[PDB]
Design a protein around this ligand. Sequence first.
Ligand code: 0G8
Ligand code: CA
Ligand code: CA
Ligand code: CA
Length: 341
Amino acid sequence: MIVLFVDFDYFYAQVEEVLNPSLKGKPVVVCVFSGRFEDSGAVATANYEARKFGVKAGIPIVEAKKILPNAVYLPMRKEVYQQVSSRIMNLLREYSEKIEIASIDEAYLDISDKVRDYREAYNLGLEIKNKILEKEKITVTVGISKNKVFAKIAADMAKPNGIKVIDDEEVKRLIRELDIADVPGIGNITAEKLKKLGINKLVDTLSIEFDKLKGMIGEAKAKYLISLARDEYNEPIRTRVRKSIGRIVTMKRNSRNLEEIKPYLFRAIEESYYKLDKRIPKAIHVVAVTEDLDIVSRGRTFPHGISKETAYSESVKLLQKILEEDERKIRRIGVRFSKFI
DNA sequence: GGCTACAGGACTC
DNA sequence: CAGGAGTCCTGTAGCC
Ligand SMILES: Nc1ccn([C@@H]2CS[C@H](COP(=O)(O)OP(=O)(O)O)O2)c(=O)n1
Ligand SMILES: [Ca+2]
Ligand SMILES: [Ca+2]
Ligand SMILES: [Ca+2]
C-alpha cells in the first residue's frame, strides 16, 4: 500500500494569517479564553515564530505572555478554520477515492491505485501541495510511506512546508533506532514504561517476553507495537464516521452546588443539540472536570432516541450522581452524545 | 469464557 | 496555571 498523509501547517494560526496577511512574520498564538480573569485560559496552537520560543499548545495564556509579551494573541475561531479545512479536504478528494479525514488538520490518502511507486508518489505530493497553495494559500506537509503510522511519522519529520518519503529501508532503520516515545499512540505515561525496561525502541518489543509487555501496557498496545516492529502493521484508510458529539464549558468559579452548575450544563446541552444537527443519539454522558483537573463522567443509554427535553432531565440526574459519588468540586461541565440512530 | 454497559485511563490534534 | 473535542482500550460486574 502507499499512503500519503497530509498535515496543514500551524493550521489555526496560518488561517488567521491568510485572513490578515500583516500577521506574516510575527509570532501568533491562538487561544481559548476561559472568562475567569484577565487572560485566563490556554493556548490551542501557535505558529513557528511563537513555537521556536516555547509557546506550545496547552500552556496557560498567562505563561505564554511571560515568554512573548508582544506576540499577537487571538481568540480561537474554529468555525472559520473548519470552513477552510472542509474546502481543502474536498481538494484532496480529487486525488483519491480512498481518503480518511482524521481531524480538522489531517487526512490520509491511499494512493496505491494512483502511483506505481514512491517516485510517482512524491510527485503526486508536490502536485497536492501546489494545488492547495494555489487555491487557498495554505502550506502543508506531506508524509509518504507504506502505512499510516510511518506516513504520519514522515510528516512529523518534515514539517513545516515539507514533503517526505520513508521507504522500506528506513522503516527498518526506524524500527531499530527511532525513539519509541516518538511513536504515535505512545504518551508520557506509556513511554515511561517502555523506556523503563530498556525498550527504547520498536525492535525491543520483539525480544521481551510478551506477557511482560502486555502486563505493563495492555494487550492492544503491545500487539500494536509488536506489529509495527515486525513491519507487519496494516490498517486501512477508511471513511471516519463521527461517533460522539458534545460540548464542555468552564464555570466562572468552581462549585458543587447543583443550581449553580445547571445553567452551564444546560447551555452545553443546547449547543450540543445544535451540533447534532439531524443525528439522534441514544446515549448521553455528563462530563465533569474536577478542581484537580481529573475527569469524571456518568452516562446512560436508552432504547430509543433522546429528545432535548429528556436530555435536560437525564443530565441533571447524572450530574447529581457525579456530585453524590465524588466529593470534589467541579471546574468544567459538559455532555457528550453518542450511539446515533 | 466471552459479550454488554459503564466508568476510568491514555492519547491525539 | 491548566481549554475544547473526540477515539479507543480496559477493569469490573451482570448474564447466558
Ligand atoms: N492541545 C491541543 C493540540 C492541538 N489543538 C488543535 C487541534 S487542530 C490544531 C492544529 O494546530 P497545528 O497545526 O499548529 O498543530 P500541529 O499539527 O503542529 O501539532 O491544533 C488544540 O486545540 N489543542
Ligand atoms: Ca497535526
Ligand atoms: Ca498541523
Ligand atoms: Ca510521544
